[PDB]
Design a protein around this ligand. Structure first.
Ligand SMILES: */C(=C/C(=O)OCC)[C@H](C[C@@H]1CCNC1=O)NC(=O)[C@@H](C)Cc1ccccc1
Length: 181
């Protein structure tokens, strides 16, 4: 098995979890220690279902920029026995484009699902169901419902979290490493 497949599968085994909130099914990325990230619209409450069990949420932080604009990312600290494998080093320091990215989804309905979203470009502002959102990126791929929280990955880098699409294009919240400091 080659290195790209092996990386995406190992992300799936150790960091990308199938979860459920009252809003439905999502892919969650565990980043390090007990810190994970979800799309803001998943609205995690005081507990969240993670694969086979209900896990309490100790804290949730919705990220905004310096103008107070939504970034569509909620950081949660979980009451789990496990520390996540620390993947912060694979997250770039600044919001980075990529060529030939894969979107990795892991939901009860869409388990270990690989989507060839292609090139990922800077996009910036996005009006996401009435909600202004910054620091987004775009891929020319017709992503669909159920894929939010999916992890945008390319060559050992973890660059985005899927948040929406207009039927011909898909959009992610960009990741940067300082979010998980
Ligand atoms: C992912 C979330 C989802 O499916 O929730 C229930 C519908 C979707 C992904 C897009 C759907 C169509 N194509 C896509 O790739 N994202 C959303 O539905 C966004 C619009 C969720 C949302 C809702 C309210 C405020 C901000 C974002």
């Amino acid at each position: 098995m080659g290195p790209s497949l092996d990386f995406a599968l190992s992300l799936l085994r150790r960091n990308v979890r199938q979860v459920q909130t009252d809003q439905g099914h999502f892919t969650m990325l565990g980043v390090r220690d007990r810190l994970a990230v979800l799309p803001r619209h998943s609205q995690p409450g005081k507990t969240i279902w993670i694969e086979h069990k209900l896990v309490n949420i100790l804290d949730a932080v919705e990220l905004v920029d310096e103008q107070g604009v939504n970034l569509e990312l909620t950081l949660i600290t979980l009451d789990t026995n496990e520390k996540f494998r620390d993947i912060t080093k694979f997250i770039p320091e600044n919001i980075s484009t990529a060529s030939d990215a894969t979107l990795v989804i892991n939901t009860e309905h869409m388990p270990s699902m690989f989507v060839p979203v292609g090139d990922v470009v800077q996009y910036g502002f996005l009006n996401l169901s009435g909600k202004p959102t910054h620091r987004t990126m775009m891929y020319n791929f017709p992503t669909k419902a159920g894929q939010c929280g999916g992890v945008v990955t390319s060559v050992g880098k973890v660059i985005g979290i899927h948040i929406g699409g207009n039927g011909r294009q898909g959009f992610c919240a960009g990741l940067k490493r300082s979010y998980f400091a």
